[PDB]
Amino acid sequence: ERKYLELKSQKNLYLARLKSAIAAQKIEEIAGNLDNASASSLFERIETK
Amino acid sequence: LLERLLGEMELELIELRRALAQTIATFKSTERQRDAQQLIAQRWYEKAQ
Ligand SMILES: Nc1ncnc2c1ncn2[C@@H]1O[C@H](COP(=O)(O)OP(=O)(O)O)[C@@H](O)[C@H]1O
Numbered sequence: 001e002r003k004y005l006e007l008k009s010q011k012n013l014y015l016a017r018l019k020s021a022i023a024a025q026k027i028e029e030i031a032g033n034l035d036n037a038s039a040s041s042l043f044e045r046i047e048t049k
Numbered sequence: 050l051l052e053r054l055l056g057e058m059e060l061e062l063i064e065l066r067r068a069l070a071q072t073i074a075t076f077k078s079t080e081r082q083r084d085a086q087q088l089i090a091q092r093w094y095e096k097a098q
Contacts, residue, residue, distance in 0.1 A: 035085045037078065048074055 032041045039045055 035082065035089075037082050044078075048078060 029040065030042050032038070037044055039048065
C-alpha cells in the first residue's frame with residue numbers, strides 16, 4: 001500500500017518534466033536563432049519565399 | 050509539331066525564369082548571412098575594446 005502511494009506521489013512530477021522538455025524542443029524548430037538561416041526554421045522559409 | 054514545340058519551349062522558358070529567380074534569392078540570403086557574421090565579429094572587437 002505504502003509503495004503504491006509513493007509511486008503515485010511522483011508520477012505527476014515526472015510527467016510535468018517531460019512536457020516542459022517537449023515544449024522547449026518544439027520552440028527551436030520555429031525560430032531557433034536569428035542567424036540560423038537553415039531553411040528549416042519557419043521564418044527563414046518565409047523570408048526566402 | 051511546330052506549334053507543339055513552340056508551346057513546350059514557352060514552358061521551358063518560364064521554367065528557366067523561375068530557376069534564375071530562386072538562384073538570385075539564395076544569393077541575397079548568403080549576402081545577408083555574411084553581413085551578420087561580420088557584425089558579430091565587430092561586436093567582439095568592441096567588447097575587447
Ligand atoms: N551558433 C550559431 N550561430 C549561427 N548559426 C547557427 C548556430 N548554430 C546553428 N546555426 C545554423 O544552423 C544551420 C544548419 O541547419 P541545417 O543544416 O539546415 O539543419 P539540418 O542539419 O536539419 O539540415 C546553419 O545554417 C547555421 O547557420
